[PDB]
Design a protein around this ligand. Structure first.
Ligand code: HEM
Ligand code: HEM
Ligand code: HEM
Ligand code: HEM
Ligand code: HEM
Ligand code: HEM
Ligand code: HEM
Ligand code: HEM
Ligand code: HEM
Ligand code: HEM
Ligand code: ZN
Ligand code: ZN
Ligand code: ZN
Ligand code: ZN
Ligand code: ZN
Ligand code: ZN
Lengths: 149, 144, 145, 148, 145, 148, 144, 149, 144, 145
C-alpha cells in the first residue's frame, strides 16, 4: 500500500528470519529456485539474462551458487532495513551490480517481486503479504535506481 | 590439530551461527572484526579507500563489512557442499583478483574473524582447531 | 459424519475458540490471513469489501459479518429446523456470486487451522470436518462440502 | 493527514528530542537554526529577499535569530504532536495560513527546506534514520504547504 | 501435493511442535490420547505394548519409538533417497501386523490435531496432509495415504 | 537399571540436544551418523559384513543412510528418556531384543561403538563433558547389550 | 570528512558530555585513556615522572589525569566561542611550553581520548568525522 | 559406592573449598601433615618414599613445601572435576610425576585415601564421606594409571 | 615505590585471593593471562610445544595454565614464610632449569598476571606498588 | 582433646558464627541472655558493668570486651606462644574477682548453645568443648575447664 513502516520492517524481519537457515544452504536454494522457476515461467526471455550462471540448469552448481548469492543479498537488505542510512549504501551497491547487466529492467524486478509473493507463503509460517510487499518494494526501489523499465 | 574435516565444519557452522547472531548485532560483530584488523595492520586501510576505510564508523564502510561477513556466511554455509563451495569461492576470488591482497592480509582478517567469534561465544567453548583450518580453506580458495 | 454429539462438541469448541471480545477480532484476522495464504487467488474475490487493505474497516466489517454467520450457523447445529433455513438464506446470498465450491474447501482447511491453533490439541478434527461440511453443503449444495 | 507509523513516529521523536528539547541551551537552538537557514540559502539565495522583514540582512541579528527560533519552535510543535494525528492537523492548517499569506513562499521553497534538514540532521543527530524521518517529515511538509 | 517447500515447512513446524525435552513426552501423550479417542477400537491393536495402561513404561516406550519414527521420517522429507528406504523399512515392520490402512487416516487426523494444537494458527493444514500422506503411502502403499 | 545422576543426565541432554535435536538439518544428522560408523569401521573392519543387509557396501546408499538414521533416532530416544529410569528400561529391553536377534552382534561390538562416540563427540559438542557422558552412556550401553 | 564545523562541535560537545559522565566514572574514564596512551607509547611515561607516570593507579597520577580531562572539558565546552576558546587554548599551550610534547604525542592522546569516548558511548553512535578534526583544533592550539 | 556424579563433584568442591585457605599456608600444612602422619602410621615403609623431601622431619621446610605442593595438586584436580576434559590432562600429568618415583604403588594411594577420610571430617565442617570418597577415587584413578599395585 | 614489604605481601595475598576466585572462573583467569602473554610475545608460544601452546583453548594447555597459576598461588601464599617460600621457589626454579626462559619472558608473564588480576578486581583498587615488586620476588626466585 | 585440626576448625566456625558487623552485637546479646538464664545468680556478678539493664551501653560495652577477648583468644589457638600469654593475661584480670570456676562451665554451655544455634547442625560439639576448655583452663587453672 503506502510505505515500509518501522512496524513493517520488524514484521518483514521476522517472516524472513524464520525460514532462514543459518547453518546450511538447503532451504536457501530451495526457496531461491522456487522463485526463479516462477519468474522464468511468467517472463520467457528472462532466463536469457542468467547465461553467465547457467540459468538453464537451475540445479547446476553455477546457478545454485548464484541463488545462494541472491538470497544472501536480500538477507543483507532485509536486515539492513533497521539501519536505513547503511541500507541506502548497500542497495546502491546492489543497484550498480545490476546496472552492469544488460537486460535487467525495472519491470523485471516488478516481476520477481510477484514471484516471491507467490513463494514465501508456501515456505514461511504465518506470512503477511502486505507488510512484506511494502518493505520488499522499498528494497527494490533502491536496487533499481538507473535501470531502464 | 588442523584439517577442516566434516565434523570441524559442522562445528564452525554452528559457532558461526551464534556469532552472526539473529540479524541485529551484526553491525557490532562487523565493527569488532574490521576494527581489530586495522589495529593490527593500520596500513591495510589504504585498500579500502572506496568505502571509507579511514572511518569504519560509516554507513559506507558498515555496508562494506556487511558484504564481507555476508560472503563469509555463504562460504561457511557451503562448507558441507564441496562442489558448490568452490564455485562460490571462485566467484569471491574473481571479486578480489586485481586488488593486491597479500597472504598475510588474509591471515589477519582470519585471525580477526576468530577473535570476533570468540568474543561473542566465549573462550570456554570455541573450537580453534576447527575455525583455524576451515577458515583457511575459504581463504585459500579466494586466494586464487 | 456429524452426530448430535459431534455437534454439541463442535459448538463447545467453537465457543472456546471464537472467544469473548477482542479475542474474536483476533481470531477473525487470523482466519482470513490463512484463507488468503492458502489460496492467494481467492483474495480478488473480496475486492468488493476492500480486501486490498486487510485492516480497512470495510474488510474488518466483512470479517465481522462472516464470523457472525459462522457463529449463528454453528450454534444452530442442534436445531435442523433453523439451521437449514439459515443455511438456505446464506445460499441465497452466495449463489449469485458464482463461487467455485472448491474455495469452501480451502475455507474448511483454514478454519481448522485457526480453530485448532487457538483451541489446543483437544480439537476434534473429524467432528469439525464433518459438521463443517453440513454447513458447506447447505451453503453451496455440492459433494458433501 | 499529517501522520506516519506510530513507531516510525516514536523514532523521529527520540531523535528530534535528542537535539532540541526544552532543556538544551540557548546557544544550541540558535546554531541548529542558523545552520538550517545558511544552508537553506546557499541552496537558493533567490530566497533571502523573502525574509527582508526579519533583518535577514544580518542573520546574526536579534530580529532574525528571533525568527529562526520561531521556526524551530514550530518544527518542534509538529514533530511532537506527530502521535496525535487530528491535532497535528490544526497545527499544519495554522502554519499553512501563516505561510500562504506571505507573498513569495512557494510550495517548493519547502521542498528545499526538507532537503536541507535531511542533509544536515545526521550531522547533529545520533543514530539518524533517514527513512523514519522521510516517512514522517514529508507527511507534514506536505500539509504545511497546502498552497502555491 | 507435497512440494519441496511444503516439506521444508512441514519439517520446520514439526520441529517447533515436537519440542525439545519434556515437551516431547507431553506431545506424544497428547497424540496418542487423540488416536484412541478418535478410534477407540484401535486401542486393542496395541495390547502388545500394554495399551491397557497408557502411562505404563511399556507404552510410553512405544510412544517413544513411534514418535522417533515420525521424527526421523519427517526430517528426511528433503532426501527422497533415505526417506524411501526408511519408509520401506517401516513398511516391513508394519506389513506383518495386517493393519487396516484406514487407521493411518485416523492417525493423520490425530496428528493434525496434536501438531496444530501445539503449534498455533500458523499450522499449514494442506502442507501437512500432503506430506503426511507421502509417509503414509510409503508405509502402507494404499490410496495416497 | 539404565540411569545416572539426575544432573549428570541433564548435562548429557543439553549436549546431545546441542547436536541432534528434531530441529537440526537432514544433512547434519546424516554426517554425525556417517562419521560414527566410518569410525566404528576403521576401528573394526571385521564388523562391516554385519550390515550387509543395509547396503553397507555403499555407506552413502539410501538403504544404509536410512539405517544410520534409525540408530541416531534410537540413541536420541535413550539419551532423552534418561530422566525416566523405568521407561528407559523398556527402551533398552527392546533395543536389546532387536540386537540379540541379529546373529553376529557381540557384547563388545558395543564397547567399540562407545569408544567411537567418545572420541568423536567432542569434535561436534560444545563444552563436552566426558565424565557425565561416561556415567550416563555406560549405564545404557550396558543395558542395550544384555546378550553375548 | 573533516573540518570541525559548528555542527560537528555541537556533536562532540554532547558526546563528550555522555563520556565525561556525571562526575563519578571519571576515574575509570581517565584510567582508560591514559592506560591506552602508554600501551601505545610506553616511552611517553618518562614525561610524567613528577606525577607517578610509572603507575597511573596512583592518587598522584589520578589527580593528574583529572587535570587533563578537565582542561579537555573546558576546550570542548568553549568550542562554540572561538574567541574565548583560543584564549584558553593559549593558556594550555603555555602550560606545556617547556615540556617536549611532539606532534605524534598529541596524535596518541587524541586517539586514546576518542577510544575512551567510544568505549563509553558505543560504536553504533560515535561521530569520528567530528571528534577527529575537532580534537585537532584543540591539540593544534596547545601545539603553540 | 558407584561413580563421582555431578552432584557429587559440587559437594566435593564445597567440602574442600570451605577448609581451604586462599591467603596462607597454615591450614594447608596442618591438614597435609595430619594426612601423611596417618599414612606413615598405617604403612611403615611408606616414609621411605619421601626421602628427597625429608619425610622423616615432617616439620622440615623441605617437607612443608612438599605438603604445600600436594595440597595444591589435589586442589587442582578437585576444582578441575567441573571440567573433566581438562581434568584428564591434569591427572595424566600428575600420573607421570608419580610413575617416575619408584615405590609409588596403586595400593599406596588406596591407603592415603583412607587417611584423608580420617582427617577431613576433623577439620572440614559438615563432611560427606561417601560423596568425597566417590570423587576422591575418581581423581586417584587418573593419577594412578601405570603404577604397579 | 617498590620493596615487597610485609604489608605489600598481605595486600597481594588478598588481591590474589579475589582474582584466583573461588575455583570456577580460573579457566577464564588463566586464559586471559596466557592470552595476553602471547599477544605481546607471539614467539613465546614455541616454548610450549608440548602443551599445545599454539591453541591455549585446549584441555592440554588449559591444564598447563592450571599448573602455572597453581604454582603462583603457592608462592603468593608462602610470601609471609620466607624460609618455606624460597624452598618452594627453588623447586620451581628446577622445574624451569633447562628451558630457556629469558628475563624478559618473566617480565611479560608478570605483567600479564597483573593485567589479569586488575581485570578482575578493578583499576580503582589494585596495588601496583605491591604486585610489581612482590611478583618479582617470586620471579627472581624461579630465575635461579 | 583439642587437636591442631580441631583448632583450625573451632576458629573456622567461630568466625562464621561471630559474624561480621551487626551480627556480632546480636550474637553477643544472645550469648549473654543464655549465660544469665542458665545461671540467673551469675548476673549479680556483673553489676559492676550494669548488668541490671542488659541493654545499657555500660553492659553492651562489657559484652563487647568479653567477645573481643573470646575472639582474640580463639583466633590464637594455632599459636601456643601468644595463646598462653594472652590467656595468662586474662587470668590476671579474673583472678582478683574470685569467681567460682563452675561459672566458666555455665559459659561453655551457653557458648555452645549460642554458636551452634547460629552456626548450624555442622557445629562440631566435641571440638568446641575441647578447645573451649584449653581457654577456660588457661583463664582459671582448674580441672581441665
Ligand atoms: C528482477 C529480477 C532480477 C534480475 C533480472 C536480476 C539479474 C541479475 C543478473 C543477471 C545477475 C548477474 C549474475 C552473474 O552474471 O553473476 C545478478 C546478480 C545479483 N543479483 Fe540480481 N537480479 C534480479 C533480482 C535480484 C534481487 C531482488 C536480488 C536480491 C535482493 C538480487 C541479488 C543479486 C546479487 C547479490 C547478485 C550477485 C552479485 C555478485 O556477487 O557479483 N537480484 N542479478
Ligand atoms: C576471508 C574473508 C573474505 C571474504 C569472504 C571477502 C569478501 C568480500 C566481498 C563479498 C567483497 C565485496 C565484493 C563486491 O560486492 O563488489 C569484498 C570486497 C573487498 N575485499 Fe574482501 N573478503 C575477504 C577478505 C579480504 C581481505 C583479506 C582483504 C584485504 C585485507 C579484502 C579486501 C577487499 C577489498 C579491497 C574489497 C573491495 C572494497 C570495495 O568495494 O571498494 N578482502 N570482499
Ligand atoms: C461457511 C463459511 C462461510 C460463511 C458462514 C459465510 C458467510 C457470509 C456472510 C454472512 C456474508 C455477508 C452477508 C451480507 O451480505 O450481509 C458473506 C459474504 C460473502 N461471502 Fe461468504 N461465507 C462463507 C464462506 C465464503 C467463501 C469460501 C467465499 C469465497 C471464497 C465467500 C464469499 C463471499 C463473498 C464474495 C461475499 C460478498 C461480500 C460483499 O461483497 O459484500 N464466502 N459470507
Ligand atoms: C518545516 C519548516 C518550516 C516551519 C515549521 C516554519 C515555521 C514558521 C513559523 C512558526 C513562522 C512564524 C509565524 C508567525 O508569524 O508568528 C514562519 C514564518 C515564515 N516562514 Fe516559515 N516555516 C518553515 C519553512 C519555511 C520555508 C521553507 C520558507 C521559505 C524559504 C518559509 C518562509 C517563511 C516566511 C517568509 C515567514 C515570515 C517571516 C516574517 O514574519 O517576516 N518558511 N515560518
Ligand atoms: C506414520 C505413522 C506411523 C509411524 C511413523 C509408525 C512407526 C512405528 C515404529 C517406529 C514402530 C516400532 C518399531 C520397532 O518394532 O522397533 C511401530 C510399531 C507399531 N506400529 Fe506403527 N507407526 C505409525 C502408525 C501406526 C498405525 C496407524 C498403527 C495402527 C493403528 C500402527 C501400529 C503399530 C503396531 C501394532 C506396532 C507394534 C508395536 C509392538 O507390538 O511392539 N502404527 N510403528
Ligand atoms: C548405542 C548405539 C546403538 C544403538 C542405539 C543402536 C540402534 C539400532 C536400531 C534402532 C536398529 C534398528 C532397529 C530395527 O530393526 O528397526 C539397530 C539395528 C542394528 N544394529 Fe544397532 N545400535 C547401536 C549399536 C550397534 C552396534 C555397536 C552394532 C554392531 C556393530 C549394531 C549392529 C546392528 C545391526 C546389525 C542391526 C541390524 C541392521 C539391519 O536391519 O540390517 N548396533 N541398531
Ligand atoms: C590534548 C589534550 C591535552 C590537554 C587538554 C592537556 C592538559 C593539561 C593540563 C591542564 C595540565 C596540567 C597543568 C598544570 O595545572 O600545571 C597538563 C600537564 C601536562 N601535560 Fe598535558 N594536556 C594534553 C595533552 C598532552 C600530551 C599530548 C602530553 C604528552 C604526551 C601532555 C603532557 C603533559 C605533561 C608532561 C604535563 C605536566 C605534568 C606535571 O604536572 O608534572 N599533555 N596537561
Ligand atoms: C598414595 C600416596 C602417594 C604417594 C606414595 C606419593 C608419593 C609421592 C612422592 C614420593 C613424590 C615425590 C616428591 C619429591 O621427591 O619431590 C610425590 C610428589 C607429588 N605428589 Fe604424590 N604421592 C601420593 C599421593 C598423592 C596425592 C593424592 C596427591 C594429591 C592429589 C599427590 C600430589 C603430588 C604432587 C603435586 C607432587 C609434586 C610434583 C612436583 O612438583 O614435582 N600425591 N608424591
Ligand atoms: C612467574 C610465574 C611462573 C610460575 C609460578 C611457573 C610455574 C610453572 C609450573 C608449576 C610448571 C609445571 C611444572 C611441571 O609440573 O612439570 C611450569 C612449566 C613451564 N613453565 Fe613456568 N612458571 C612461571 C613462569 C614461566 C615463564 C616466564 C615461562 C615462559 C615464558 C614459563 C615457561 C614454562 C614452560 C615451557 C613450562 C613447561 C611446559 C610443559 O610442561 O611442557 N614459565 N611453570
Ligand atoms: C572464656 C570466657 C571469658 C572470656 C574470654 C572473658 C573475657 C573478659 C574480658 C576481656 C574482660 C574485660 C577486661 C578488661 O577489664 O578490660 C572480662 C571481664 C570480666 N569477666 Fe570475663 N571472660 C570470660 C568469662 C567470664 C566468666 C564465666 C565470668 C563470671 C561468671 C567472668 C567475669 C568477669 C567479670 C566480673 C569481669 C569484670 C568486668 C568489670 O567489672 O569491668 N568472665 N572478661
Ligand atoms: Zn589480535
Ligand atoms: Zn582466546
Ligand atoms: Zn589504539
Ligand atoms: Zn570503533
Ligand atoms: Zn599489556
Ligand atoms: Zn590499569
Amino acid at each position: 500500500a503506502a510505505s515500509c513502516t518501522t512496524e513493517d520492517r520488524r514484521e518483514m524481519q521476522l517472516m524472513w528470519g524464520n525460514v532462514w537457515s543459518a547453518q546450511f544452504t538447503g532451504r536457501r536454494i530451495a526457496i531461491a529456485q522456487a522463485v526463479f522457476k516462477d519468474l522464468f515461467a511468467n517472463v520467457p526471455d528472462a532466463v536469457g539474462l542468467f547465461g553467465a550462471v547457467k540459468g538453464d540448469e537451475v540445479n547446476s552448481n553455477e546457478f545454485k551458487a548464484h541463488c545462494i548469492r541472491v538470497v544472501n543479498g536480500l538477507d543483507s537488505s532485509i536486515g539492513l532495513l533497521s539501519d536505513p542510512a547503511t541500507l541506502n549504501e548497500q542497495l546502491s551497491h546492489l543497484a550498480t551490480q545490476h546496472k552492469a547487466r544488460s537486460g535487467v529492467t525495472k519491470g523485471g524486478f516488478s516481476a520477481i517481486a510477484q514471484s516471491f509473493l507467490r513463494v514465501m507463503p508456501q515456505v514461511a509460517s504465518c506470512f503477511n503479504p502486505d507488510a512484506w510487499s511494502r518493505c520488499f518494494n522499498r528494497i527494490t526501489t533502491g536496487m533499481t535506481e538507473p535501470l531502464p523499465a | 590439530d588442523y584439517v577442516c574435516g566434516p565434523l570441524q565444519r559442522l562445528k564452525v557452522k554452528r559457532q558461526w551461527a551464534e556469532a552472526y547472531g539473529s540479524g541485529n548485532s551484526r553491525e557490532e560483530f562487523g565493527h569488532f572484526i574490521w576494527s581489530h584488523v586495522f589495529q593490527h595492520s593500520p596500513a591495510a586501510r589504504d585498500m579500502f579507500k572506496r568505502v571509507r576505510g579511514d572511518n569504519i564508523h560509516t554507513p559506507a564502510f558498515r555496508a562494506h563489512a556487511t558484504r564481507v561477513l555476508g560472503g563469509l556466511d555463504m562460504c561457511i554455509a557451503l562448507l558441507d557442499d564441496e562442489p558448490v563451495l568452490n564455485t562460490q569461492l571462485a566467484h569471491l576470488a574473481k571479486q578480489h583478483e586485481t586488488r593486491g591482497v597479500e597472504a598475510a592480509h588474509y591471515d589477519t582478517v582470519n585471525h580477526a574473524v576468530m577473535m570476533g567469534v570468540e568474543n561473542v561465544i566465549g573462550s570456554e567453548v570455541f573450537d580453534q582447531d576447527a575455525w583455524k583450518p576451515c577458515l583457511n580453506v575459504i581463504t585459500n580458495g579466494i586466494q586464487g | 459424519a456429524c452426530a448430535m454429539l459431534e455437534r454439541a462438541k463442535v459448538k463447545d469448541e467453537w465457543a472456546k475458540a471464537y472467544g469473548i471480545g477482542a479475542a474474536r477480532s483476533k481470531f477473525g484476522d487470523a482466519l482470513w490471513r490463512n484463507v488468503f495464504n492458502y489460496a492467494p487467488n481467492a483474495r480478488d474475490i473480496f475486492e468488493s469489501v476492500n480486501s486490498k487493505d486487510m485492516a480497512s474497516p470495510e474488510f474488518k466489517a466483512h470479517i465481522a459479518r462472516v464470523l457472525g454467520g459462522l457463529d449463528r450457523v454453528i450454534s444452530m447445529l442442534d436445531n435442523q429446523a433453523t439451521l437449514d433455513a439459515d443455511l438456505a438464506h446464506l445460499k441465497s446470498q452466495h449463489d449469485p456470486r458464482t463461487i467455485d465450491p472448491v474455495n469452501f474447501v480451502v475455507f474448511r482447511k483454514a478454519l481448522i487451522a485457526t480453530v485448532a491453533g487457538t483451541f489446543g490439541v483437544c480439537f476434534d478434527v473429524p467432528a469439525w470436518q464433518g459438521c463443517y461440511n453440513i454447513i458447506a453443503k447447505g451453503i453451496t449444495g455440492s459433494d458433501a462440502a | 493527514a499529517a501522520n506516519c507509523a506510530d513507531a516510525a513516529a516514536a523514532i523521529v521523536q527520540a531523535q528530534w528530542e535528542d537535539v532540541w528539547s526544552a532543556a538544551a541551551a540557548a546557544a544550541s537552538r540558535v546554531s541548529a537554526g542558523e545552520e538550517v537557514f545558511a544552508a537553506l540559502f546557499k541552496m537558493v539565495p533567490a530566497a533571502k529577499n523573502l525574509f527582508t522583514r526579519v533583518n535577514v540582512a544580518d542573520i546574526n541579528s536579534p530580529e532574525f535569530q528571533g525568527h529562526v527560533v520561531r521556526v524551530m519552535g514550530g518544527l518542534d510543535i509538529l514533530i511532537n504532536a506527530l502521535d496525535d494525528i487530528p491535532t497535528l492537523e490544526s497545527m499544519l492548517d495554522h502554519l499553512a495560513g501563516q505561510h500562504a499569506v506571505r507573498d513569495g513562499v512557494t510550495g517548493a521553497g519547502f521542498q528545499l527546506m526538507a532537503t536541507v534538514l535531511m542533509e544536515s540532521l545526521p550531522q547533529v543527530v545520533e543514530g539518524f534514520n533517514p527513512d523514519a524521518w522521510a516517512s514522517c517529515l514529508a507527511g507534514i511538509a506536505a500539509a504545511i504547504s497546502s498552497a502555491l
